[PDB]
Amino acid sequence: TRDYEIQRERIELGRCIGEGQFGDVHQGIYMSPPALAVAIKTCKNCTSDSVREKFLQEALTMRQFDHPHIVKLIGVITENPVWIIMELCTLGELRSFLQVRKYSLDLASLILYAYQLSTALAYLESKRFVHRDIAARNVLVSSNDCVKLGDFLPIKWMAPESINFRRFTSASDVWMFGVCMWEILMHGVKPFQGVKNNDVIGRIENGERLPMPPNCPPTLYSLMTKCWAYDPSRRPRFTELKAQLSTILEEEKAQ
Numbered sequence: 421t422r423d424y425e426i427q428r429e430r431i432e433l434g435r436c437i438g439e440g441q442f443g444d445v446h447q448g449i450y451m452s453p454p455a456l457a458v459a460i461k462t463c464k465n466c467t468s469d470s471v472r473e474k475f476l477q478e479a480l481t482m483r484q485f486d487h488p489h490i491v492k493l494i495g496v497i498t499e500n501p502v503w504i505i506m507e508l509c510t511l512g513e514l515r516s517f518l519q520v521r522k523y524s525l526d527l528a529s530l531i532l533y534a535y536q537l538s539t540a541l542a543y544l545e546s547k548r549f550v551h552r553d554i555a556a557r558n559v560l561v562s563s564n565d566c567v568k569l570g571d572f573l574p575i576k577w578m579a580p581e582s583i584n585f586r587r588f589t590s591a592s593d594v595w596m597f598g599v600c601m602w603e604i605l606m607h608g609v610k611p612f613q614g615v616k617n618n619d620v621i622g623r624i625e626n627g628e629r630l631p632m633p634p635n636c637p638p639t640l641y642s643l644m645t646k647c648w649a650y651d652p653s654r655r656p657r658f659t660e661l662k663a664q665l666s667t668i669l670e671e672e673k674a675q
């Protein structure tokens with residue numbers, strides 16, 4: 421909460437590195453004893469307390485976590501203009517990174533990002549925290565072998581129970597991770613491209629699933645289809661996913 425208060429003069433604003441829900445995201449420097457590279461989330465309408473509460477809720481959420489593959493909260497500036505200071509992931513959005521590098525990223529690197537993500541999600545499951553929005557767009561790239569989970573209606577990523585009843589559980593997070601894994605092996609291509617959101621549920625309920633991505637190991641696809649069990653109680657947990665992705669990665673790093 422308040423132990424994360426940073427005074428503004430300890431922050432040098434830099435160039436705009438993208439956009440967020442509340443305002444522009446900036447690169448910048450945080451000076452305090454060694455002047456570190458950071459991401460400054462801004463909020464244009466934060467003069468209104470209802471917006472301010474919603475915006476600073478991400479800071480409140482992220483304070484609770486400490487993991488190598490979850491974006492770190494550095495601090496907050498509660499006075500106007502309200503800012504959220506975070507760890508900078510220089511390579512940006514995963515979706516864009518995967519697209520740009522479609523012919524410059526091997527299978528091993530793709531499986532590695534899936535593995536890394538499963539470790540952040542196993543950690544969140546251990547804290548009994550439900551993410552509700554696991555998708556490639558919410559993953560950031562720190563380096564070419566280090567991705568981070570960054571965000572704290574996506575019908576095409578949602579488990580049927582989330583669509584039908586707005587139920588969000590650890591099981592529904594596993595479904596979304598399966599979709600995210602598919603997005604990674606499909607080089608940032610969006611799931612169900614061409615299908616209307618309202619027709620997705622009907623396809624799922626007819627047993628229809630996202631196809632095997634080209635060059636995807638059938639063992640990795642078998643893991644994804646397990647995430648897409650209609651019955652949430654039949655889906656694996658992140659602990660098992662992490663362990664299986666770990667073995668799949670070695671099965672690739674060798675041959």
Ligand SMILES: Cc1n[nH]c2c[nH]nc12
Nearest residue numbers: 445459506507508509510
């Ligand atoms: C946080 C955050 N949002 N966008 C970013 C790029 N690097 N770090 C971040």
